Design a protein around this nucleic acid. Structure first.
Ligand SMILES: [Zn+2]
Ligand SMILES: [Zn+2]
Ligand SMILES: [Zn+2]
Ligand SMILES: [Zn+2]
Lengths: 55, 56
DNA sequence: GGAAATATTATATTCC
DNA sequence: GGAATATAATATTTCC
């Protein structure tokens, strides 16, 4: 499960290529109101709670 | 800039950003939690952590 | 201009 | 075991 780029290795594959996105620049999670893109869903979840809501 | 870390020699824009960075070497965690005793290297990191403790 | 806060990003660690 | 939550470091933005 080792990073082909930085010689780091994790216990899971899911953790492995969340890490890869820090190398390849892939950012699959996108904010509906803003267009800014993130590497993980939790990040965008944090960044989303900064846009004022409307419900 | 003029402010360089004496451990990793990465330069920082302003001395106050350097003193926070040095805490990532010394392990000095000044800011402590009122409810749970967990110590944090910055006031901000303590804020995002404190704001989940249900109610005081 | 510089300190402080806020937003950001990567990852370890719980959760499910 | 993947997904969520917490976390730590720093880049960006706000305030002064
Ligand atoms: Zn890597
Ligand atoms: Zn947005
Ligand atoms: Zn350093
Ligand atoms: Zn606490």
């Amino acid at each position: 499960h080792k990073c082909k780029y930085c010689s780091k290795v994790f216990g899971t594959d899911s953790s492995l290529q969340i890490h890869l996105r820090s190398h390849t620049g892939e950012r699959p999670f996108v904010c509906s109101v803003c267009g800014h893109r993130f590497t993980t869903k939790g990040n965008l979840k944090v960044h989303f709670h900064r846009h004022p809501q409307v419900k």
